[PDB]
Protein backbone atom coordinates (compact mmCIF):
# COMPACT_ATOMS: atom_id res chain seq x y z
CA UNK A 1 0.00 0.00 0.00
CA UNK A 2 1.47 3.38 -1.15
CA UNK A 3 4.84 1.55 -1.72
CA UNK A 4 6.76 4.60 -2.91
CA UNK A 5 10.44 3.86 -3.56
CA UNK A 6 13.43 5.98 -4.49
CA UNK A 7 12.03 9.28 -3.22
CA UNK A 8 14.18 11.96 -1.58
CA UNK A 9 12.49 13.47 1.53
CA UNK A 10 12.69 17.27 1.29
CA UNK A 11 10.54 18.17 4.36
CA UNK A 12 8.53 16.20 6.96
CA UNK A 13 5.73 15.74 4.43
CA UNK A 14 7.15 16.43 0.93
CA UNK A 15 9.07 13.75 -1.07
CA UNK A 16 10.40 13.97 -4.64
CA UNK A 17 11.50 11.57 -7.44
CA UNK A 18 12.65 11.87 -11.04
CA UNK A 19 9.94 9.70 -12.59
CA UNK A 20 6.92 9.60 -14.90
CA UNK A 21 3.76 9.92 -12.67
CA UNK A 22 2.01 7.28 -14.87
CA UNK A 23 4.78 4.69 -14.26
CA UNK A 24 4.75 5.53 -10.55
CA UNK A 25 0.95 5.08 -10.39
CA UNK A 26 1.21 1.69 -12.15
CA UNK A 27 3.85 0.37 -9.70
CA UNK A 28 2.50 1.86 -6.47
CA UNK A 29 -1.35 1.95 -7.19
CA UNK A 30 -1.57 4.70 -4.57
CA UNK A 31 -4.75 5.62 -2.66
CA UNK A 32 -4.76 8.97 -4.53
CA UNK A 33 -3.08 10.16 -7.76
CA UNK A 34 -3.37 13.88 -8.52
CA UNK A 35 -4.16 14.92 -12.12
CA UNK A 36 -2.95 18.35 -13.38
CA UNK A 37 -6.42 19.14 -14.80
CA UNK A 38 -8.18 22.04 -16.57
CA UNK A 39 -11.65 23.37 -15.62
CA UNK A 40 -13.57 21.21 -18.18
CA UNK A 41 -11.63 18.02 -17.36
CA UNK A 42 -10.55 17.57 -20.98
CA UNK A 43 -7.32 15.45 -20.77
CA UNK A 44 -5.73 16.33 -24.10
CA UNK A 45 -2.01 16.43 -23.54
CA UNK A 46 0.79 16.54 -20.99
CA UNK A 47 0.25 14.84 -17.63
CA UNK A 48 -3.56 14.70 -17.98
CA UNK A 49 -3.36 13.10 -21.46
CA UNK A 50 -0.82 10.55 -20.24
CA UNK A 51 -2.90 9.57 -17.15
CA UNK A 52 -6.02 9.28 -19.35
CA UNK A 53 -4.17 7.20 -21.98
CA UNK A 54 -3.06 4.77 -19.21
CA UNK A 55 -6.73 4.19 -18.22
CA UNK A 56 -7.54 3.66 -22.02
CA UNK A 57 -9.92 6.64 -21.95
CA UNK A 58 -11.96 5.50 -18.89
CA UNK A 59 -10.87 8.68 -17.05
CA UNK A 60 -12.16 10.87 -19.90
CA UNK A 61 -15.58 9.11 -20.06
CA UNK A 62 -16.02 9.51 -16.29
CA UNK A 63 -14.81 13.16 -16.37
CA UNK A 64 -17.34 13.97 -19.15
CA UNK A 65 -20.18 12.56 -16.95
CA UNK A 66 -18.94 14.64 -13.94
CA UNK A 67 -18.92 17.82 -16.07
CA UNK A 68 -22.38 17.14 -17.52
CA UNK A 69 -23.90 16.78 -14.03
CA UNK A 70 -21.82 19.29 -11.98
CA UNK A 71 -20.46 21.82 -14.45
CA UNK A 72 -16.80 22.88 -14.76
CA UNK A 73 -14.39 23.33 -11.87
CA UNK A 74 -12.92 26.71 -10.99
CA UNK A 75 -9.22 27.62 -11.20
CA UNK A 76 -7.84 26.62 -7.79
CA UNK A 77 -10.48 23.89 -7.30
CA UNK A 78 -10.75 20.12 -7.47
CA UNK A 79 -12.90 17.05 -7.63
CA UNK A 80 -12.44 13.41 -6.55
CA UNK A 81 -13.21 10.78 -9.18
CA UNK A 82 -12.21 7.11 -9.68
CA UNK A 83 -8.52 6.32 -10.07
CA UNK A 84 -9.45 3.34 -12.31
CA UNK A 85 -6.38 1.01 -12.77
CA UNK A 86 -3.92 3.69 -11.57
CA UNK A 87 -5.11 4.49 -8.04
CA UNK A 88 -8.16 4.12 -5.70
CA UNK A 89 -9.03 7.80 -6.45
CA UNK A 90 -7.97 10.56 -8.79
CA UNK A 91 -8.01 14.07 -7.38
CA UNK A 92 -8.35 16.38 -10.44
CA UNK A 93 -6.78 19.75 -9.44
CA UNK A 94 -6.81 22.91 -11.50
CA UNK A 95 -3.65 25.03 -11.10
CA UNK A 96 -3.49 28.43 -12.89
CA UNK A 97 -2.11 28.40 -16.43
CA UNK A 98 0.01 31.58 -16.46
CA UNK A 99 0.82 30.96 -20.19
CA UNK A 100 -2.92 31.80 -20.71
CA UNK A 101 -2.97 34.74 -18.19
CA UNK A 102 -4.40 33.13 -14.98
CA UNK A 103 -3.26 34.52 -11.53
CA UNK A 104 -0.40 32.89 -9.56
CA UNK A 105 -2.23 33.49 -6.18
CA UNK A 106 -4.49 30.57 -7.22
CA UNK A 107 -1.54 28.10 -7.08
CA UNK A 108 -1.83 28.12 -3.21
CA UNK A 109 -5.60 27.37 -3.52
CA UNK A 110 -4.83 24.52 -5.93
CA UNK A 111 -2.30 22.89 -3.52
CA UNK A 112 -4.73 23.39 -0.61
CA UNK A 113 -6.93 20.62 -2.18
CA UNK A 114 -4.17 18.08 -1.41
CA UNK A 115 -4.84 18.57 2.35
CA UNK A 116 -8.10 16.51 2.21
CA UNK A 117 -6.07 13.30 1.53
CA UNK A 118 -3.51 11.74 3.87
CA UNK A 119 -1.18 10.43 1.11
CA UNK A 120 -0.97 11.54 -2.57
CA UNK A 121 1.14 10.85 -5.66
CA UNK A 122 1.26 14.16 -7.54
CA UNK A 123 2.85 16.23 -10.28
CA UNK A 124 4.35 19.72 -9.80
CA UNK A 125 1.26 21.98 -10.33
CA UNK A 126 1.22 24.67 -13.02
CA UNK A 127 4.74 23.61 -14.23
CA UNK A 128 5.56 22.59 -17.89
CA UNK A 129 3.19 24.14 -20.46
CA UNK A 130 1.14 25.88 -17.70
CA UNK A 131 4.06 28.36 -17.46
CA UNK A 132 4.65 28.75 -13.70
CA UNK A 133 8.27 28.79 -12.44
CA UNK A 134 8.66 25.14 -11.31
CA UNK A 135 10.88 26.07 -8.34
CA UNK A 136 8.21 28.57 -7.20
CA UNK A 137 5.58 25.81 -7.53
CA UNK A 138 7.71 23.58 -5.25
CA UNK A 139 7.94 26.39 -2.66
CA UNK A 140 4.12 26.79 -2.68
CA UNK A 141 3.74 23.01 -2.28
CA UNK A 142 6.11 22.93 0.69
CA UNK A 143 4.43 25.93 2.35
CA UNK A 144 0.81 24.83 1.78
CA UNK A 145 0.61 21.04 1.81
CA UNK A 146 0.57 19.47 5.27
CA UNK A 147 -0.44 15.91 4.30
CA UNK A 148 2.11 13.43 2.82
CA UNK A 149 2.85 14.25 -0.88
CA UNK A 150 5.07 12.24 -3.21
CA UNK A 151 5.97 14.43 -6.19
CA UNK A 152 6.98 12.78 -9.45
CA UNK A 153 8.85 15.14 -11.81
CA UNK A 154 9.59 13.53 -15.23
CA UNK A 155 12.82 15.44 -16.07
CA UNK A 156 16.22 14.81 -14.43
CA UNK A 157 17.42 18.35 -15.32
CA UNK A 158 14.46 19.95 -13.49
CA UNK A 159 14.64 17.44 -10.66
CA UNK A 160 18.30 18.38 -10.06
CA UNK A 161 17.52 22.14 -10.12
CA UNK A 162 14.63 21.62 -7.65
CA UNK A 163 16.75 19.56 -5.24
CA UNK A 164 19.66 22.04 -5.57
CA UNK A 165 17.42 25.02 -4.82
CA UNK A 166 15.80 23.23 -1.89
CA UNK A 167 18.94 21.65 -0.36
CB-CB contact of 54 with 73 (8 Å): no
Which one, 68 or 113, has the nearer CB to ligand A1ANK?
Answer: 113
Which one, 47 or 81, has the nearer CB to ligand A1ANK?
Answer: 47
Contacting positions for ligand A1ANK (CB under 6 A): 20-22, 36, 46-47, 50, 123-124, 127-130, 134, 152-155, 158
Which one, 75 or 158, has the nearer CB to ligand A1ANK?
Answer: 158
What are phi and psi for residue 26, nearest 5 degrees?
A: -65, -35
Which one, 10 or 50, has the nearer CB to ligand A1ANK?
Answer: 50
Please give the Cα distance from 16 to 138 (Å, whole number): 10
Indicate the length of the chain as a whole number: 167
Measuring CA to CA, which residue among 166, 147, 163, 154 is closest to residue 32?
147
Please give the Cα distance from 11 to 154 (Å, whole number): 20
User: Shortest gap between Cβ of 46 and ligand A1ANK (angstroms)?
Assistant: 2
User: Shortest gap between Cβ of 45 and ligand A1ANK (angstroms)?
Assistant: 7
Amino acid sequence: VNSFSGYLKLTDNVYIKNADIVEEAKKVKPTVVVNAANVYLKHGGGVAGALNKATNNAMQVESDDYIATNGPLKVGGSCVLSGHNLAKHCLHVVGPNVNKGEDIQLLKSAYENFNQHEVLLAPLLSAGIFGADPIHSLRVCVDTVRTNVYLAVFDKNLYDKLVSSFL
